[PDB]
């Protein structure tokens, strides 16, 4: 995360780290959506132009974490994967359309002060909250600039109107994406970056005071560049698929 700050303890208890077994290293961010399901970006798992195709046995999820590198004894929980589910129309060939995947845990994780699931939006909350100017929050242990942080980082960012999103890039943008970030002249700045992939963009509903995950960190050209914006998978748009997968697995 660029130009964010250190997270508070327990501030993002749904934050998950995708972790490589060998060599042991951070791979991506992710989120806890129930005691046995984790949500992440498909490109965290499958990206053939980079010869990336991870399978369950390559990976672990670490839940309840604050520090990036430390093993947080008596606090984090580490979980093995039962099954990875990738959107079948995930478009890695062109623009990362439908950049979303689910991971089912071998065994359920125990909730705690540091481990708790995020809500997924209903159509009304989404319609309510996904407006230009409305700020969400993104969290991650990724790059601090275009080194790496000691603890989880947090940054709040405004949703950007779709024509400005579209006009900032040569990529073909879809309804399954949204973009977020300050405009060059808006003064403030901040962005997700390499390593933040698959982590959540969340919003706090003013109607019932719960946190909802509206987005997944997906792509961007550079990090925190003027006139460029971070792009996020639109979780509500793909909820149908989400519900199917969980409903039948």
């Amino acid at each position: 995360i660029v130009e964010g700050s250190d997270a508070e303890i327990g501030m993002s208890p749904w934050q998950v780290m995708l972790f490589r077994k060998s060599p042991q290293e951070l791979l991506c961010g992710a989120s806890l959506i129930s005691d046995r399901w984790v949500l992440t970006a498909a490109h965290c798992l499958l990206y053939p132009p980079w010869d990336k195709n991870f399978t369950e046995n390559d990976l672990l999820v670490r839940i309840g974490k604050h520090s990036r590198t430390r093993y947080e004894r008596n606090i984090e929980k580490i979980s093995m994967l039962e099954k990875i589910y990738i959107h079948p129309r995930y478009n890695w060939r062109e623009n990362l359309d439908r950049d979303i995947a689910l991971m089912k845990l071998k065994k359920p994780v125990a909730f705690s002060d540091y481990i708790h699931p995020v809500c997924l939006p209903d159509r009304e909350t989404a319609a309510s909250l996904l407006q230009a100017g409305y700020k969400g929050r993104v969290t991650g242990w990724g790059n601090l600039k275009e080194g790496q942080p000691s603890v989880l980082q947090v940054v709040n960012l405004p949703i950007v109107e779709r024509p400005v999103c579209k006009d900032s890039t040569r990529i073909r943008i879809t309804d399954n994406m949204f973009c977020a970030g300050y405009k060059p002249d808006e003064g403030k700045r901040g962005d997700a970056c390499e390593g933040d992939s698959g982590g959540p963009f969340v919003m706090k509903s003013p109607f019932n005071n719960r946190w909802y995950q509206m987005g997944i960190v997906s792509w961007g050209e550079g990090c925190d560049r003027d006139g460029k914006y971070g792009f996020y998978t639109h979780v509500f748009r793909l909820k149908k698929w989400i519900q199917k997968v969980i409903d039948q697995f």
Binding site: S22, Q24, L26, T69, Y71, M80
Partner: peptide, 11 residues
């Protein structure tokens, strides 16, 4: 790189 070793039990 710089990661603290995790319990071998999780691997």
């Amino acid at each position: 790189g710089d990661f603290e070793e995790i319990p071998e039990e999780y691997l």
